């Protein structure tokens, strides 16, 4: 940091600006940090009698974090559309962050009234791990983001994280990590924090639709010159009799036709509607749900694959899970109807995966014979197969950036299942805590943890920039695209904007994928 | 009130042994427990379960 | 007849771990028995009690 | 090694060469090497039922080993003597070490009959530790020695250790040690192997005997000017009354003299006589034994501290396990009456050192009163105190020249309790063994361990030369010393040589303490 107590540690920006192919943005906010566990670490785990799957063991910190990671923080709602209406991708390169006009405030709640004043000379401690050496708990969607809208404000949450247990007990290879045990950063009034990251190499996002599906990719004015066998028997005088018969495959025969390449894999769906009345009455919801099966427990796949959520002129129906799900404006916890909730809808990708709620195709059971007939089952489950290729899942407005790739001996296209980025070398987690000040020990000495401290909390305003790279569009297509639009009719509020009580709100789910390319 | 902070510096002795067969090693048990050693408990109160010596490896007399 | 000879030059990777409390180790057990692991017999045929693995040391996910 | 299975890989060196201040000596062995446990380790331990303190629990191993630790390898009678007449001390500083003329042989054993046949290309190997990895079996004075006598021929002695057990049983902290697990050299007829060595400082060894007892160190013809408490009472009419009187003490007094230094430490021996009549009939041998006590079990501490033998004019009597003692030719292991021992006698040492056989002096038990009468007790053992001198154990000319100290946080005075020259790093202990050959295996494959093996053994010469570092005398002493002296009278034999059937005898103990010194 630098100089006084009257002099401000740093300015304020946020700002975005369009240099063509690279472009750059930057916000800026006000925060707020509480003592959380009066100033000491506690384990946790799940209460008493719960389920297997529900079990669980781990420690909670006095520290807290903050969270960037989700794209509304960064992208304002008219920023986005310079990026998904002009653009066929973009991906992050650097980052940079920023902590500044920390101050720091001590509470009295004697009586009915509490006073509020400043602590000049109290600290607050910060650091970045950047080895990794903690368990890393951001890319799991919690809360606690950046707001979108600039002018709020937002406490910071708590940190803590889990390791393995049986039941509800340890395990003896369960690991403990003290967030004192590194060196951090020790920051008055005037002093200030900073560091940059650079992103390693990752593929551009794709913000494109296709314009060809899989199943049609070539000329229907000429046939093929491949057979097919087409005809399995042929009339004689009163009664067929076996006879092979082949083909060429040519416009009317396009169901008939060889190709080169095959669909991406699936792992299927139960398939609701959106109008009650089609639904079945039951609950269906944990029993109904497709899961995975791990060390004895039962976990649903929330995102799951990526497969297109519905088929042509189904508009009515949605994955189980197979969905992203966001709640509007002041939605509470649990149990809430489906007007409150917001579901994206994954379409475009219709042209490669296949849709989630149906099976892969159809394949051979039996070896016929003159007394048998064939025979065919359905696979609901299908793993990849050289040949094959698909589409990830699309990132929308808000929602995860990125997301860590777990440190293992081997995985399969990183990119991670709820959208956005996968690195091996994430931006690291930032750290920060209230440095505890004892009150008024006792005159004789006394060796005992000391269960008294002076009541106190910080705030300030933090800083972060992001630099991105573009890929812009050569598209030779004659007619226009499909482009984002706000309406123009007359409406009571504006979309992504404060009401009368003040109160900002988003309206729905805005994705990236409009402009189109050929496949 | 404030902090103080010590930092030492220390040498070692590393070991050339010709012994065959496993040593003596420290261990932690690897059952399940209520508790975690050498770990704060639910309270939130540190504590260490057991003394802890130095005297493992073996040399030759 | 004769005698062979192999040498093989290996790469390791060491570990920074934040972990505070201790991890499990390979020990061998030091109550008294008949015969030590992993050594000759009064007959004198070499054998190996058990397999012994790699995977000790914690990492997180 | 160098050249040909026709080339000799060394010449024959025995010689002494005497340069006055630092002299040397060598000297050539032969040797043969059987093999042993047919090539595999073996463990070993106490035999089933025994007494608590004989268990043990160790290996013995294939491998052989050289010992030269005797002085009587070294140095012939009469080289002994330009030694221990004309000097008052000897060190040890480097020596060398040489195998050579290395040649193995094989044996057919069937019918009646064995034929013995060079194995040209058959091989041996050695190697030396050096870095005190392995038990350090050397020290303990056992067989195996280089002979005394040039012409003689010796086998290797078999190698072996022990380790830490309970009862028979061994503990997980016990210790394996596979000798094949070392880097060697592998040699052939026509391969030769060398290494030098080099002493640490270590004080001279002490030839010297006292001319001054350390109760008298003074003038007799000057009185003290020191008082000492002479007479408690004095006669007062009828009876006595208590009246303290003072003396100085003179050359009638010399009993109660003031002194700046006290005698060395003792731990109590039991005493018998050669004479067998004043020997009381009982078993006491274990029972009256000196001893100590470690670890549940009990050993007798044969040599112990080092305390002279006898006092004055009594020459029939010796400490029970104090001395060291030595066979006469051709002794048998058990058993075995006292004319066939030789039995070493400490005297010299009378004038620092106290007798082994008596108490370190008396001490004061209790506190005096008018009613009370003054009371002490003899004690047995002392330990070593301020102010305190003594001398060590003489090493005579057949016996441990070195010891290894142990590796240890804490030791005191290290010259060991046998004799000579205690070392941190001593002469690395020499291994070698013969290179199994194995015999005619069978035409399909087998995975087992063989147990048939060619049946052969080698043999060669091996060489040492030690360099020797000497401590002239100064002295003033007008009449004659006393020498070690051959007997001038006619006999049947000659000492120190052949007898008509050509088996080489030592007659008698010989040790180094002859000149004389003052105190
Ligand atoms: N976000 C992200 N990171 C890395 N790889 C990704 C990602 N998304 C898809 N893939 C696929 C396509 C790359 O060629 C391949 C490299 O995996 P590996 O060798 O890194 O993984
Ligand atoms: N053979 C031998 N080696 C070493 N010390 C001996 C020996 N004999 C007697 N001492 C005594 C006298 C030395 O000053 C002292 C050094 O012990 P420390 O410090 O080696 O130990």
Not at 230 to 250: E, H, I, K, W, Y
Not at 281 to 287: F, I, L, M
Request: hydrophobic share 30%; proline share 6%; net charge neutral.
């Amino acid at each position: 940091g630098a100089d006084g107590v009257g002099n401000s540690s740093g300015n304020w920006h946020c700002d975005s600006t369009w240099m063509g192919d690279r472009v750059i943005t930057t916000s800026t906010r006000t925060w707020a940090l509480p003592t959380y566990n009066n100033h000491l670490y506690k384990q946790i785990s799940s209460q008493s009698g719960a389920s297997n799957d529900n079990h669980y063991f781990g420690y909670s910190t006095p520290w807290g974090y903050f969270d960037f990671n989700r794209f509304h923080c960064h992208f304002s709602p008219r920023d986005w559309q310079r990026l998904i209406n002009n653009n066929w991708g973009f991906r992050p390169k650097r980052l940079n962050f920023k902590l500044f006009n920390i101050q720091v405030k001590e509470v009295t709640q004697n009586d009915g009234t509490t006073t509020i004043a400043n602590n000049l000379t109290s600290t607050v401690q910060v650091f970045t791990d950047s080895e990794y050496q903690l368990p890393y708990v951001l890319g799991s969607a919690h809360q606690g983001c950046l707001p979108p809208f600039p002018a709020d404000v937002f406490m910071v949450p708590q940190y803590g994280y889990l390791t393995l247990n049986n039941g509800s007990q340890a395990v003896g290879r369960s690991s403990f990590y003290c967030l004192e045990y590194f060196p951090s950063q020790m920051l008055r009034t005037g002093n200030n924090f900073t560091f940059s990251y650079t992103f390693e190499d990752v593929p551009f996002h794709s913000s494109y639709a296709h314009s060809q599906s899989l199943d049609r990719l070539m000329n229907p004015l000429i046939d093929q010159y491949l057979y097919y066998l087409s005809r399995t028997n042929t009339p004689s005088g009163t009664t067929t009799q076996s006879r092979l018969q082949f083909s060429q495959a040519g416009a009317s025969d396009i169901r008939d036709q060889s190709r080169n390449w095959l669909p991406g894999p699936c792992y299927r769906q139960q398939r609701v509607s959106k109008t009650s009345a089609d639904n079945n009455n039951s609950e269906y919801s944990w029993t109904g749900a497709t899961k995975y099966h791990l060390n004895g427990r039962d976990s649903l796949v929330n995102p799951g694959p990526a497969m297109a959520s519905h088929k042509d002129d189904e508009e009515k129906f949605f994955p189980q899970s197979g969905v992203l799900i966001f709640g509007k404006q002041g939605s509470e916890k649990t149990n809430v109807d489906i007007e409150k909730v917001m579901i994206t809808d994954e379409e475009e990708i219709r042209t490669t995966n296949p849709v989630a709620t149906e099976q892969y195709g159809s394949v051979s059971t039996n070896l016929q014979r003159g007394n048998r007939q064939a025979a065919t089952a359905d696979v609901n489950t299908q793993g990849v197969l050289p040949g094959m290729v698909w589409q990830d899942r699309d990132v929308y407005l808000q929602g995860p950036i990125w997301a860590k790739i777990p440190h293992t001996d081997g995985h399969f296209h990183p990119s991670p299942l709820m959208g956005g980025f996968g690195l091996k070398h994430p931006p690291p987690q930032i750290l920060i805590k209230n440095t505890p000040v004892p009150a008024n020990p006792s005159t004789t000495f006394s060796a005992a943890k000391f269960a008294s401290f002076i009541t106190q909390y910080s705030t300030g305003q933090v800083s972060v920039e992001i630099e991105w790279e573009l890929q812009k569009e050569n598209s030779k297509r004659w007619n226009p695209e499909i482009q984002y639009t706000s309406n123009y009719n007359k409406s009571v509020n504006v979309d992504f904007t404060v009401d009368t009580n003040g109160v900002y709100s988003e309206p729905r789910p805005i994705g990236t994928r409009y402009l189109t390319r050929n496949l």
